[PDB]
Design an enzyme around this catalytic site. Sequence first.
Site, PDB file in Angstrom:
ATOM      1  N   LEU A  99       0.511  -1.430   0.001  1.00 29.84           N
ATOM      2  CA  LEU A  99      -0.044   0.058   0.236  1.00 29.84           C
ATOM      3  C   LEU A  99       0.873   0.949  -0.406  1.00 29.84           C
ATOM      4  CD1 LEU A  99      -3.265  -0.734   1.665  1.00 29.84           C
ATOM      5  CD2 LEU A  99      -2.902  -0.196   0.039  1.00 29.84           C
ATOM      6  N   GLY A 100       2.123   1.106   0.568  1.00 28.31           N
ATOM      7  CA  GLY A 100       2.607   2.811   1.216  1.00 28.31           C
ATOM      8  C   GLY A 100       4.354   2.238   0.889  1.00 28.31           C
ATOM      9  N   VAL A 116       2.810  -0.280   4.549  1.00 30.88           N
ATOM     10  CA  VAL A 116       1.675  -0.495   4.849  1.00 30.88           C
ATOM     11  C   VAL A 116       1.062  -1.458   4.288  1.00 30.88           C
ATOM     12  CG1 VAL A 116      -0.073   0.042   5.575  1.00 30.88           C
ATOM     13  CG2 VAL A 116       1.779   1.490   6.337  1.00 30.88           C
ATOM     14  N   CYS A 140      10.743   5.148   5.430  1.00 32.41           N
ATOM     15  CA  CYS A 140      12.517   5.264   5.921  1.00 32.41           C
ATOM     16  C   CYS A 140      11.955   4.686   7.259  1.00 32.41           C
ATOM     17  CB  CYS A 140      12.442   6.144   5.906  1.00 32.41           C
ATOM     18  SG  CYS A 140      12.002   7.790   6.325  1.00 32.41           S
ATOM     19  N   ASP A 186      -0.269  16.554  14.450  1.00 32.31           N
ATOM     20  CA  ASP A 186       0.070  16.798  12.760  1.00 32.31           C
ATOM     21  C   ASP A 186      -0.965  16.453  11.995  1.00 32.31           C
ATOM     22  OD1 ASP A 186       1.240  16.703  10.312  1.00 32.31           O
ATOM     23  OD2 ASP A 186       1.866  14.836  10.265  1.00 32.31           O
TER      24      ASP A 186
END
EC number: 2.7.10.2
Length: 266
Positions: A17-18, A25, A21, A130
């Site tokens: 999915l991703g 996922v 560093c 965030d």
Amino acid sequence: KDAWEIPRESLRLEVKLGQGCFGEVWMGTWNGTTRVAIKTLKPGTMSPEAFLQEAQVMKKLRHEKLVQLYAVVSEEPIYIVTEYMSKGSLLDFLKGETGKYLRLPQLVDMAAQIASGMAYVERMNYVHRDLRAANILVGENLVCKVTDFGLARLIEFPIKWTAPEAALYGRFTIKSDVWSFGILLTELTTKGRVPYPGMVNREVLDQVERGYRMPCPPECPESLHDLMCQCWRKEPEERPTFEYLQAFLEDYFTSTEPQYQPGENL
Ligand SMILES: COc1cc(Nc2c(C#N)cnc3cc(OCCCN4CCN(C)CC4)c(OC)cc23)c(Cl)cc1Cl
């Protein structure tokens, strides 16, 4: 070890999915029954603590409008498992095929759920640090959730989204969080555009500290952009609670803009 730990063999990773560093996922299955999302670690890349002390915070929080922490596994391959949000971040969702069909009511409503998730964060005496479309996830039926608590602390940096006091002086509060929320509203009203178009970081900080504020997004109601400006008050204590924000958005089309008429984009 606590009652959050499961065997690795409970799981199974499938579709990537991703990458990062930090690790990666995956879409997974859980004990053969449960579509999950798993977030692996690249074993030596981060601390053991670092990769997970984001998710101690996810154990002590629980709300429909936050992403559900399912389990952890704590020898490498080190993982954390969560509910699977089917449509990925709000940023992508807003830029993708469906984004252009979204109009105010779906957008104000998404802002609502988010406000609601934060308003809980708010009363649990916490700050996220965030908050932005890209740390929000989507499911079906336009269900939005807050996640990415990788910096989320108990009250004892991407400046465009960060509050001044928080960027300059490290003063993060739920109120600095409100500041971002307000930026997030402009993402939602622009269908994903980056804040302060054509401005660079130091340009933002300089102009923001000079009292500049993003103007009203096209087709956005002034009442909506006023709320934003309330969120971006120089004085954090004078910035609205998320519980104010939650209810103002939920009741938006009845109490504030009962005369809203859909336009070209909004
Ligand atoms: C497990 O642990 C963690 C996982 C995450 N991140 C995610 C959580 C959570 N949580 C839940 N669900 C997610 C689903 C994702 O992809 C969905 C498919 C994307 N597509 C959109 C376009 N269409 C056409 C095809 C589908 C995804 O990758 C984009 C990341 C997700 C975070 Cl931020 C922190 C922790 Cl600790």
